[PDB]
Design a binder for these strands. Sequence first.
DNA 1: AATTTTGCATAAAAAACAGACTACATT
DNA 2: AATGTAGTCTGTTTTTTATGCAAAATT
Lengths: 83, 82, 52
Amino acid sequence: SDVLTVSTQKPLRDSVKQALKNYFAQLNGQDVNDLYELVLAEVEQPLLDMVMQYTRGNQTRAALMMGINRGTLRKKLKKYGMN
Amino acid sequence: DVLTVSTQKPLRDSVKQALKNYFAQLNGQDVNDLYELVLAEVEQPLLDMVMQYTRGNQTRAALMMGINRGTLRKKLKKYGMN
Amino acid sequence: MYLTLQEWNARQRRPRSLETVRRWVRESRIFPPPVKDGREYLFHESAVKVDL
DNA sequence: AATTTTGCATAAAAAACAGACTACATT
DNA sequence: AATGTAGTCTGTTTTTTATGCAAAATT
């Protein structure tokens, strides 16, 4: 049924929900102002590492598989110190 | 380190395992929308959690998320969160 | 009626790199010649590659 | 009653986009 | 020879943003 799942198997969305549930528990009155970016960077980097590993360093195929502009991929790879 | 999931391994490790499993099931299938696919799986729980924390207050949810309120109501409308 | 350079190519018997398909437009190898509307090319759904 | 949130409109900055083109690689 | 890719650019469109404001809702 679900295409992105983790090892019994469960959806990746269920693991994100649990990761944030823990974060809000270990948030003893802290003001948070960058939660989107924090989650995005934690999910973008392993996606970039896995796709680049899959395409064997081929940027053009990674971008084509991801459905993002090649110039956009190159920027994200630079952001995470990967190129 | 800050975003982790119980045995406690980090979240990036759960994304890596989901994609390893995904590439394995690609039986001749031609991938074209992987960024959005991952993003939509990660965006729905984030929006669910942050709104649950702010008790449905979008003003506070946008501030916590570091995004603009307009951008938030757009993402909410996309995942049918109305 | 009209496709993007990417759509047109995806529909080809042997799709190529978008870099290759652009070189073709730049070299006048696509007939009828795609028009550039802003940032993109617009291929008529019937457009073919020609041997020069 | 007072204060905050929301829904929606702008305009501009920021991001993502298609393409151009060269040097070198792979087919 | 023709095609494919990294890297460096240009110009265009789309998304995000700050801001103003009135109605609605919460305090």
